[PDB]
Design a protein around this nucleic acid. Sequence first.
DNA 1: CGAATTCGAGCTCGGTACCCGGGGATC
DNA 2: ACAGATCCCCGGGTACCGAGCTCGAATTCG
Lengths: 1088, 266
Amino acid sequence: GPTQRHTYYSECDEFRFIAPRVLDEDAPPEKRAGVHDGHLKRAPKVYCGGDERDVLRVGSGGFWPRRSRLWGGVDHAPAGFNPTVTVFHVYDILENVEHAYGMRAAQFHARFMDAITPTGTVITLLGLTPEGHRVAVHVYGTRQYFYMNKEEVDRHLQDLCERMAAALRESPGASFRGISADHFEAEVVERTDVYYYETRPALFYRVYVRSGRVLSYLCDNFCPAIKKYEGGVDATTRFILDNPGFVTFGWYRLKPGRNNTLAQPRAPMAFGTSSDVEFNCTADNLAIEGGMSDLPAYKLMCFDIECKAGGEDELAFPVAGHPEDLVIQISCLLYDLSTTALEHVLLFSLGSCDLPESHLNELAARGLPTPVVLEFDSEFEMLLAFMTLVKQYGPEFVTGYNIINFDWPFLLAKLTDIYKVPLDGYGRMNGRGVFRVWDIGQSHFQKRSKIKVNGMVNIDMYGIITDKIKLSSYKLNAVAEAVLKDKKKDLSYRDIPAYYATGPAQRGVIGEYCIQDSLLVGQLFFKFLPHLELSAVARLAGINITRTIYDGQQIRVFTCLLRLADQKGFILPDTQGRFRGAGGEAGRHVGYQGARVLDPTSGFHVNPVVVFDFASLYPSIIQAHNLCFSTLSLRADAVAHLEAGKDYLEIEVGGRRLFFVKAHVRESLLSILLRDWLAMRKQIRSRIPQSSPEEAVLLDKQQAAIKVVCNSVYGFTGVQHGLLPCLHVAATVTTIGREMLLATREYVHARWAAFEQLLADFPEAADMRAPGPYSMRIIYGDTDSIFVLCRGLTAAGLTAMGDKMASHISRALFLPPIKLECEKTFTKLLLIAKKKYIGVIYGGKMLIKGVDLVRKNNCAFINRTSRALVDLLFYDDTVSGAAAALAERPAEEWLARPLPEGLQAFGAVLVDAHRRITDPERDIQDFVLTAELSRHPRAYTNKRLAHLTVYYKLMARRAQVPSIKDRIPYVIVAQTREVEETVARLARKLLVSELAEDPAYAIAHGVALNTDYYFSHLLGAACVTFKALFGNNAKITESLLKRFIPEVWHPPDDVAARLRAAGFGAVGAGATAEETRRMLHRAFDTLA
Amino acid sequence: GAPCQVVLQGAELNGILQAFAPLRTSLLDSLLVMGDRGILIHNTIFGEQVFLPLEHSQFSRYRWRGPTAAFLSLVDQKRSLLSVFRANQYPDLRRVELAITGQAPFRTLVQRIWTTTSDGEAVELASETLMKRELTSFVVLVPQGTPDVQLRLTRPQLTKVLNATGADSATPTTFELGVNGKFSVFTTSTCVTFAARENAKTVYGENTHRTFSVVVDDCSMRAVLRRLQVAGGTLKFFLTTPVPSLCVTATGPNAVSAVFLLKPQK
DNA sequence: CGAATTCGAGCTCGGTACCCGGGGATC
DNA sequence: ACAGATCCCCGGGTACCGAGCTCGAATTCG
Ligand SMILES: [Mg+2]
Ligand SMILES: [Mg+2]
Ligand SMILES: [Mg+2]
């Protein structure tokens, strides 16, 4: 039998049969509602076509692809199966801490048994051999280690003296035990701290820990006075940075490393990971061989959940903990990730399932494998089959839509709570592995809900499409429509147990919606190929894919900085006591001044506005002036032996007068770290000019996604409580940034503000002179832009010469890495507010930059209408002329004199938008506002919030409770007497917060919407953008924009019934047009 | 230029300034209905109808053509087309030019103000001049007919009657002219009586013989009539028709009036 | 004797300033 | 057990003072 025992169900005879008692029509209508419960003494069972095969019998051959070599020990591989592998691809590195007494029947070589001998850390590399075999190479002898000043360990304590001390200093409140001399090594090595240029090399003790206890010593236990220097570095990072060139997602090779030592396949019965061929190499039997650029047939699985809810209410969103709310069926598509192919389209069902012949024919007409439908009578015996598939088939990558929040936590909550089956073994290693979903929703500080599974890369697509597209509501139906130009047909949950209570001919319709959903997921994954784009950064950083998906951006930057640090004789200090010890001195904290926003000369600007943009400004200030920690001398003693201007820079940043050393006496680490990343954004910007206009947009978002990780370099510096905060360098970065903009403006104004000075500097402007008078006047800046309104010049070649101005200002003012570029030229820019502007690029596309039309909250109906008003201002001609004519007179002076007869087209879309809002034949789904939950809803200081109100209405009526960061939809329902007893029962010009209502509840119950709210909000949006024409006061525009809308008056009807009954005349619309005048003539004689 | 030009020249303008003055900040949410015959001003005051005719002779000249327009007085939702006549705003006024230049549906009306400067001079303040627009479709229910007993109930006693009315809905007051002109406002709390004619209780009217008894169920009558601060000078009574209407008119330079609905009797 | 002004106490609601929180722009 | 930054505009919900409102409990005044 095995030595490391397997912790995944290989056999069973007893489970918790739970099977909604609707599958058995041998009971009358009284035992239909409900679910069964109670143990069984049968071994679980799957029917696929009318065959019975107990779910855990590997053998004759299953309804699923078996991709494993082992099952409960018994080697299920053809005899003689001894593949040789020497070029394997690794995707996920694991660390596991095995033991010498735990593996004695393993029959290893002595080298290996020596590596772990008390204990040790074994880095399992984990991947595919190109032919197809799943290889798991176990690399021994990698020790994590943290350094500590020799002096501070030579006062607090007072080599082997150190380790003998530290070994039993750990002892108290034992979790470690038996910790001996052979568990730590000290060695004195000589290295400098990273911070400040004044800091001399010193003598440190390099403490080599044996396994995964540094975190205890680096926890406050050991000696808080002693500053442990690098204690967060993992075994994996200590494996990736000190063997040169190794990368954690890339092809390897298996070489006879040293002594001509040789890697050692295990016996099949000592496999630590259920894979085909497993090896015991050591750190340096591996090589990193390149030129092979391929992805070896990793099998991506793409799965979905559909779940039923029972007992006493069927229109209730099911909850995992309830033994009765139970999963019904799950898709499982299995793809091939090298060819984008699909195979095996599995669907797992709870009881009899058919599929409509439309679905089987549509699939075969799309060249997709025929679905395989497995009928499991019991729910446990389903979810065991499913996590027997993900442990036999063993998808390397997993995908879904909202798998991290609803699919996986429901499935795991159901296994671990209700059926009590270990999930630690169903990962890739068959025992003592990790299978965990961390929800953000634990009143916490993180932004990610992470799932970590042992050797599977759970790429959710909710993340990825919420980072690639700016879309109001990210539900699969809307994202399929928007992203794929597709028309999906949804199945709201509420009608699931009406299609389930019928016979199989409607469980088939449920299987149709499951498979057709998860094929759509598959289509988005292959559209965006997240695995390759996260792969690139896993290679570039040294972090795994599983840590480049779910662990933010300080880690990739810290790890690159760590590879630069420990090749230059540097050591990266570790500050701990982070924020729940906070900053030690014994509304939103802005740790430094950040940026400049020059004052916008607000207005419509018909003249060419030529913008100049610094090219990734911050990363070229961390290079032009070599700003890193390591050159930060912030006193004036240690920079005394070098002269002003040629070897250092002085900058008052907060008042500090930091001195930053020049490049040729010390060279940064942020400058050098950035050089590698920049060329990566330069290749992804290279590919843009030669791609499809839809495959260009994905290489546009891959370059924005690396613009964020390069500028994260600046960010990471300037964080507080981070992994290596230095707000001195971040403050400087922003200082030099603000200065560089004001320098550029005092150069563009002083130098080029008489046209004859243009003609002497760019003589190509002799023909560019448009007839008007000349003025180059910067009207707006931002952290790098400067909008240079060039008046009296034609827009035709203004970008042609503007490449020259951006190459003149750059050379004449800034250091060579800094590059000012003339990225665009607007004509008809509208500068509404500080970070808000709409302008139409020269001859073409419109750039809308944050005007309540480029943001995810505002209702679709109001976005269509202000999106038509902007077109009626820029593209139209009489309206553009008229808008420009509304600069002749100050704002006040348009409240008396009428609007100059060009804007009658502008007003038409407002009176027409007002006509459409009132129609009783509105579609609620067009009026749906939506806003992000963004926090646990009990961490909110302000609790009277629209979306919050709708989150408690949702959670109260047993409905789907949107997990944190889900956009809550909400439509504002009319103020009526039912929206006023419900508040009072839950507790009078009601707030907009307490008229919020979920549109599912606003269609099933035919509630009216506010036609005051939504129209006041439409004029609110319209007003915020169009103030910019009128003076930039919103009160004048609000009074002029709504003058367009017809106003109408009627007596409140019943009062009119009474008045009429009193024998008055109706004068106007309620009569026709010649009953108004004659009788209103009589009324005057009456009152006269 | 503007077809429909109406002007208030200084002598008439200080006539209508005093006519508008008493009604402080009432009717500044008015609905101005302008037809060939003058301009009529309407409003709900404490949920009850109130009117103010402005016939030609009031101001200097009137000229109008095309359909009667209606301007929902409150202009830009804080400023009011009739603010100019509040009798301490823009104190030393001169000619005010209302004119409307449009065509039939979409008419718009410009209120131009002129302000003295003491030589005989005056500055048009094109800083507060107003621009309103016609209501597109407006239905306003205007009193009509001829009352059947109009009595002139003069300045003191129109305080006596409103005080003789009560506080809230418990206590409906009852106007009841009896034979030979009693004209008593009865109610449980107190009673006020008059002589009705065709010594300062001689309430002068006409054709008073047509006896009525009527009961007023709106508790608001004192409220609004005081709010307007009328000097009194007629109660107009429309008995004929169902839910007979009690209108009340003042007899100073204004003619503001307020129709009171009544419960079925006579 | 008379009931016709007032400068006091209640009103609104404008319109300030405030926070928050959503969600953009810029690295 | 987690982890780029700041700047900035609007909108919703408070929480004031206050200037303008009539609306009275003394009134000065006829
Ligand atoms: Mg799902
Ligand atoms: Mg830039
Ligand atoms: Mg650029």
